[PDB]
């Protein structure tokens, strides 16, 4: 019996009946798109995030893209993005025609270094795109201070941070503009692709409802250009159930995280995640860093432990960004991260003893 | 009990059991994206379409857009579109960075007029985007010829034409490049958004699989830029079932169509839809034309009949484009269709009697009026 990285089936199994019923409900409704499930989810998700509006879309990527779009970002604009993140973050900027400008993470936290952000700002800069990587919130007060002083917008990539808190407030609260993914493996996931943009701005909320719907807010009418990026009634129905358990599931993750942080303490060659001050991380991913990453991975594999790497290739070095990003060596932080990082099993369906088993193996290796 | 325009619920009911099971299987599989269902559906669909490959995506708009992108179409490029079509057709083009260039349909056929294309070809023209509107195929032979002569690609908008035939061939057959929508209300629909691109080109197929998946064909690798545009396992499973009944269901629409054509014969003010020669329409929509359609619709409503208009505003006149399209009065065909069309209830769940009822009301209005 192996230790799985993240059991999707178990999420279904835990709420089988409720899940089956919601789906059955949608089926019987004869309403599959832009229905009451979506409205209910949005309402519920908005309140959860301590904000006014939730606009369900098709995926975390569109969420980011439509948010930037709705904020008027496009060609000739620069959007500061993190050098250390998942490629989609950059892709969403690219998709709008705007230019992504990478900024290195903090020396101790996998998020955007505020000090380094300021330096990257230019007259073409229009927005900051911090990513609350692995469920860890970036230094929002600092970034906001900067944004205000430079007249920039802030679109948050909260795809790995559902429910997290920064200085006691939910990610996406108030005047925030935050994008989320409901991809099956996310903290809050469904059985297909899904996403959302949360915002406290009524005009932005309106544009998003339009942009995700062929630029229309009335049948047969198309006021602006737009696309097809919606969250199905089926998925939304399921989301409503998961949402009700979100805090509890994240709680489970935190508990597991405490174990790892405690059991992995003081190990040679094992760099542990640092929780930023006044933050409540959601541990979408539990990451460790070591110079002998490949070795540790194999050892874990040998010990029957499933792992993933987030991410083996720094965005700037992916062929997808060939000829457009800084040269290797020019983003050493992202580079070192990519080569040292490993994700340990974590989830709301992973049990204490399983986590302890993982600790045994990492320990053995570190002590090897 | 009114006559519904298109009962989605009935589609579920008719296959309730199998449908239920398909979904249950997926839930239980623990695999929700890029799985067996998608692979199976793709296989089945490509075959159905008489082609080699099917690339399932999120929507018909994405399908169109990804096809164009895959063909290298973009900024600085022009794509000839029909002046009479659903806005998404132009939107797909815009989304790539290219420019949609409208060309009129035939006078009495809701498809791109091959004779007016050439005149719109420019040095930036990279493709033709014919639309098999309402389930009626556009004149493919003439279009390919023209396209071949100009070194242009052809991306067909087949969102309303699943299973139709052109000169005996399925829409999307062989070397075609055709995009479909699986939106709930389409001829082949699911319980959410869904789409697909079919092609006999192995390279384009590979590009599309990548474009729809963040430019990746392997974990951790992103060879090229890409996006997120996938057809869910749940939706794909349902679609395999529906696909199996497609021909059957389309057959029902054809019979109703024949019923309408027959009963609405001899109504001078009511323009009836024309079936081009050598085509096998799938009648996604049964459209009649008449000046005074708003009145007719009123009449039908009163008579308890639901109807729709596809479409009331021609694309060039929507605010989304107006700033960049030809002026009002310069696209008389698109304009005339927009002002005269009316869609009568049609679908695999509409019965002969209900349709008779529709005919009676139409006849009465025409007779009064
Ligand atoms: Cl619907
Ligand atoms: Cl419309
Ligand atoms: Cl999955
Ligand atoms: Cl990756
Ligand atoms: Na979807």
From Swiss-Prot, chain A:
The protein's enzyme class: transferase
GO molecular function: pyridoxal phosphate binding; transaminase activity
Annotated keywords: Antibiotic biosynthesis, Pyridoxal phosphate, Transferase
Requisite cofactors: pyridoxal 5'-phosphate
Reaction(s) catalysed (UniProt annotation): dTDP-3-amino-3,4,6-trideoxy-alpha-D-glucose + 2-oxoglutarate = dTDP-3-dehydro-4,6-dideoxy-alpha-D-glucose + L-glutamate
CDD domains: AHBA_syn
Keyword Transferase: yes
InterPro entries the UniProt entry points to: DegT/StrS_aminotransferase, PyrdxlP-dep_Trfase, PyrdxlP-dep_Trfase_major, PyrdxlP-dep_Trfase_small
Pathway(s) it belongs to: Antibiotic biosynthesis
EC number(s) on file: 2.6.1.106
Short name of any one Pfam family annotated for the protein: DegT_DnrJ_EryC1
Residue numbers bearing the N6-(pyridoxal phosphate)lysine modification: 186
Binding-site positions, pyridoxal 5'-phosphate: 60, 160, 181-186, 214, 220, 228-230, 311
Gene Ontology biological-process annotations: macrolide biosynthetic process; polysaccharide biosynthetic process
Membership in a protein family: Belongs to the degT/dnrJ/eryC1 family.
Subunit and interaction comment: Homodimer.
Its job: Involved in the biosynthesis of dTDP-alpha-D-desosamine, a sugar found in several bacterial macrolide antibiotics.
Entry protein name: dTDP-3-amino-3,4,6-trideoxy-alpha-D-glucose transaminase
Organism of provenance: Streptomyces venezuelae
């Amino acid at each position: 019996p192996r230790v799985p990285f993240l059991d999707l089936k178990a999420a279904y199994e835990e709420l089988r009946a409720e899940t089956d019923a919601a789906i059955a409900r949608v089926l019987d409704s004869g309403r599959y798109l832009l229905g009451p499930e979506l409205e209910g989810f949005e309402a519920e998700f908005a309140a959860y995030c301590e904000t006014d509006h939730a606009v369900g879309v098709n995926s975390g990527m569109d969420a980011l893209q439509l948010a930037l779009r709705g904020l008027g970002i496009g060609p000739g604009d620069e959007v500061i993005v993190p050098s250390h993140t998942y490629i989609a973050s950059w892709l969403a900027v690219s998709a709008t025609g705007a230019t992504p400008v990478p900024v290195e993470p903090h020396e101790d936290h996998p998020t955007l270094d505020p000090l380094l952000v300021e330096k990257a700002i230019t007259p073409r800069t229009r927005a900051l795109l911090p990513v609350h990587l692995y469920g860890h919130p970036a230094d929002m007060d600092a970034l906001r201070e900067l944004a205000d002083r430079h007249g920039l917008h802030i679109v948050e990539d909260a795809a790995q941070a559902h429910g997290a808190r920064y200085r006691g407030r939910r990610i996406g609260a108030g005047s925030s503009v935050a994008a989320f993914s409901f991809y099956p493996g996310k903290n809050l996931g469904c059985f297909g692709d899904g996403g959302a943009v949360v915002t406290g701005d009524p005009e932005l909320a309106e544009r998003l409802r339009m942009l995700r719907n062929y630029g229309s807010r009335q049948k047969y009418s198309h006021e602006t250009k737009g696309t097809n990026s919606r969250l199905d009634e089926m998925q939304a129905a399921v989301l409503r159930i998961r949402l009700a358990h979100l805090d509890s599931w994240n709680g489970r993750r935190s508990a597991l995280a405490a174990e790892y942080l405690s059991g992995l303490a003081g190990l040679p060659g094992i760099g542990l995640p640092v929780t930023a001050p006044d933050t409540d991380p959601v541990w979408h991913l539990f990451t460790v860093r070591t110079e002998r990453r490949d070795e540790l991975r194999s050892h874990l594999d040998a010990r029957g432990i499933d792992t993933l790497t987030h991410y083996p290739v720094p965005v700037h070095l992916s062929p997808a960004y060939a000829g457009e990003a800084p040269p290797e060596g020019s983003l050493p932080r992202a580079e070192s991260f990519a080569r040292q990082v490993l994700s340990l099993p974590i989830g709301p369906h992973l049990e204490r003893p399983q986590a302890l088993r993982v600790i045994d193996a990492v320990r053995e290796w570190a002590e090897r």
